[PDB]
């Protein structure tokens, strides 16, 4: 083949393009939007459903659904609209000509991967495809064969240890807390300063407040004290319609949910303890190299101060005699897709695709014997 | 102390009285009103503002302002008249004599609770006070350590799950739709039958139409079909001055907004879906006992048929494997205040009051470190 | 004494009672749990810690901690709550009056036995005590003085060869895989069918799924092929909250971790290989009588088909010239406690107790010269 696609069919935001390009060709919301009002205009070019940037643009008149929840596809009829849009609108390919690398979280339901395999061969007729783990792809972008990858998206956070190119699948950790739960918690805490955000259109406004204003405080109790000497840490922000809102300790109490999942009431260890537990499930000789190669990936790792905070916290859990080093590159917003564009381009990978001629004799069950 | 005051400082309607009474000593409109017409009579007892039953009585000559919107005090200069009137006129006690229990919605703005705290210690000089969640009080009145309380007053509808007396604040739900929004919708749909209601006093006339004649259908499409065999479900009502109006399917299409908020153009779950979502956000082992102890509170839960409609709808959402039971007691019009009268009476509660001596060294910020 | 106590302080299930009784007087979860939510009701039995069935019953609002991990007590402040509950709450004895037989896995830390001795004399003031090896007690319940015992609890699996009443301590094997690791692996593989169990309360739901439905395949590859021609091996389970989960090959792929520890990623012999390797470490003349007396003990030996599988596999490793018999009694769930109740009742054992008079001139290091 001369060109494959790589599609990072993620929660909240899809990244899409071709193998061997250095960054995604297309990046848009993993959203389908549907009207919630009467179509009172006549001769208007009214469309029954909107997807990606069209839905994000028109959202005052729409109800917005993400067809992926926690890295699991929950609405296949609208997920087919996202893949149809992806290929025919801004990639503008013929899917029958290009083999597609697809992307998934570890410890997902098998039925997700099977129906995703079925749609690619039976609805899009692709030549071939493969499903790769987001955290395995994240080491190709880094240029490594050992590291522990913390990947944190819109839906799921997960840790995957790799040493000398072998995964330790028994030491993988998954966590149903990422960019959506932080946005919902930001909506909840913004209520107590007097602002209301509740519609699926207002959750997108609060996602922009989260992306623009929020950060990870290197010591939470000292930052909560600092914010009581107020206006020192406060930022103003301008809503659609031009009303201004101001934010204080909620600017960093929001991202702290990653380190203290008890803020959203769940009983699980923080992302620091989860990375440390994942290294401690690994065999003793590999732990020293995993601590030094603690890779970060995905948009929920983009906060200011989060690499510093997690270096402070893994260094408090690990023994003091060795170098915890956290590798947070500036393109980590796309390092899954970038690593998929490398893998789909490798000359040795071209024998590993599931081909149409191998699917159609074995059914969607083929994807469990041929993929990790 | 020998007695304590207790107030549900309600949206639309205040309830007030003393600890250990089995019902409120006073219940009256949460209203202040000012003249909108000339005082032409010389030697008249002319007065520049009115409150409660006095404003409700003079409402031909007044414009009526509710100083509480959606459970938030939006007009302190008139809310201070409501609290002043409450203590000095129909409770007729000196506020410095008795500590006050006070009442709030969950997820409210912190500035509301702070300013309420300040006014009680600095305008009314009370010995001590506390602020309690309307739904936590409703389990004291119902005699339970566990339940999910749907509370629906004039201004707000909210759900609080409680199990073994511990609340789950991650699973709390709040909804800016209750008795006011149903009254505004009733003005709009009575206008489809040609009746005009637009002044604030006409909203009180339409509120009496709602309170006297409205009800919840067990199945809306069957009731809308039944109303096409007309004059069966329809009723007649007598206005002030003695004119009469006849009320059609708007008699049950009004309360159905609680189950279909899209009738008033907002994009949110109905009260059945939001109570189910609140149970489904809880820890799995507690859900069986929340379905069995679903408690109704506040005047917007007083419609005929609402318990039967909600038992039907929650039974359709929940798995059939277990017994949904909705506890709608007849005193649920006052169950918040009744629960406060129990809480203020308990010997083990008297250490939980914020005392004047504990406020004046910490300011109104004391309330967030002693209330829920 | 007229009665001693015997307390099999095992991982995650404590079995306790009097010497001379035929079964444990008390059996309960070896668990302590603490609230993880705000207590909003007051005038109530609010309690800062729950233990045993109180923790297991209220688990929907608790984080649950096991104070024993792999047969090692890791949290003594909660193990003292388990013994205090054992003695005062449902044995309802005064410990000062009764000598107590305690119990431990072989190849444990010496400090675990020392601190366990210290607490019994300095916190509970017992007249005397002893620490027995759980596999030596499994021969006492079995009514034989030669055999090899596969004991497998919640924390640890171990083999102890005994011939003519002498143990062969060079031939003891210990494996840090038993009922907890199988439960945790079932949480992992249930995720691949779409069910997330993640809290320490949901781990108890998965432990009940494991106990009710899981079984050991006689031939794993034949059973996997049988489950691929599906629906014949599937069963379903009703959760708390009344949602139903169906379970298929994960019903027997879970217990196969005992025969293939590489499923949880650990490098070791399976329980068949570890038992055979233990017989091979023994002196050649005893091996015939060890194969003829392969005793099984503890709850992780309770799966349907495990005796048939374990006999099938030892019979393939051992030479065909002689007969393997596996002795898996129907009471084997309590055979350590039953055998401890026999040992503590023997007239020949009453010289072997460590007495308070013999502890308080030697310190807790007495337990290394007087016990096993
Ligand atoms: N600069 C930023 N600060 C904070 N959050 C961000 C930033 N950029 C993106 N995000 C968040 O990252 C989440 C998804 O990013 P991504 O890694 O693409 O996840 P996914 O792989 O699930 O699509 C979104 O919820 C978005 O709000
Ligand atoms: N019989 C009734 N039918 C319908 N609505 C009622 C009835 N009685 C009271 N209400 C409504 O209940 C609302 C407030 O009741 P209440 O429970 O006191 O709320 P709050 O606690 O907010 O004061 C008012 O808007 C009123 O219209
Ligand atoms: N019928 C059963 N089938 C499978 N596992 C069981 C059964 N009964 C008990 N267990 C398991 O046995 C384990 C502990 O049993 P036990 O022998 O008391 O161990 P311990 O001595 O460590 O307390 C628990 O993890 C439980 O899940
Ligand atoms: Mg991602
Ligand atoms: Mg109320
Ligand atoms: Mg045991």
Numbering used by the authors:
A (entry chain K), B (entry chain J), C (entry chain L): 4 to 375
Quote the authors verbatim.
Arp2/3 complex is composed of seven protein subunits and nucleates the formation of actin filament branches on the sides of preexisting “mother” actin filaments. Elongation of these branched actin filament networks powers eukaryotic cell and organelle movements. Like actin, Arp2/3 complex is an ATPase. ATP hydrolysis and release of the γ-phosphate from Arp2 and/or Arp3 regulate the turnover and mechanical stability of branched filament networks.
Our analysis of the filament geometry also reveals minor twisting of the mother filament compared with a helically symmetric actin filament. To further assess filament twisting, we estimated the excess end-to-end twist, or ‘cumulative net twist difference’ from the average twist of the straight filaments, over the length of the filament. Thus, ADP actin filaments are more compliant in both bending and twisting than ADP-BeFx filaments.
